[PDB]
């Protein structure tokens, strides 16, 4: 499960394919295609995964799989 609080973790949704706006279809990080009901995480670049799989990615790097954008929080009272 998360390892963050709720109100800490990446935004996340449930994949449905009859409203699905995004181009991607797939989670590089497990290479499988996403499925109905499946939770998806979304980073500040507009990439998105499976929760599972990006979280776990996330702890060890820091960034995006598929830009290695740093997904880390901006903070306003430090650099
Ligand atoms: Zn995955
Ligand atoms: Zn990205």
Same mark, same amino acid.
């Given at each position: 499960? /998360?390892?963050?609080?709720?109100?800490?973790?990446?935004?996340?949704?449930?994949?449905?394919?009859?409203? !699905?706006?995004?181009?991607?279809?797939?989670?590089?990080?497990?290479? #499988? *295609?996403?499925?109905?009901?499946?939770?998806?995480?979304?980073?500040? #670049?507009? !990439?998105?995964? !499976? $929760?599972? #799989?990006? *979280?776990?990615?996330?702890? $060890?790097?820091?960034? #995006?799989?598929?830009?290695?954008?740093? $997904? /880390?929080?901006?903070?306003? *009272? /430090?650099?």
């Amino acid at each position: 499960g /998360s390892t963050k609080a709720d109100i800490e973790q990446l935004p996340s949704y449930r994949f449905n394919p009859n409203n !699905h706006q995004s181009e991607q279809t797939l989670c590089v990080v497990c290479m #499988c *295609d996403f499925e109905s009901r499946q939770l998806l995480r979304v980073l500040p #670049c507009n !990439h998105e995964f !499976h $929760a599972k #799989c990006v *979280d776990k990615w996330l702890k $060890a790097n820091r960034t #995006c799989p598929i830009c290695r954008a740093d $997904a /880390s929080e901006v903070h306003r *009272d /430090s650099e």
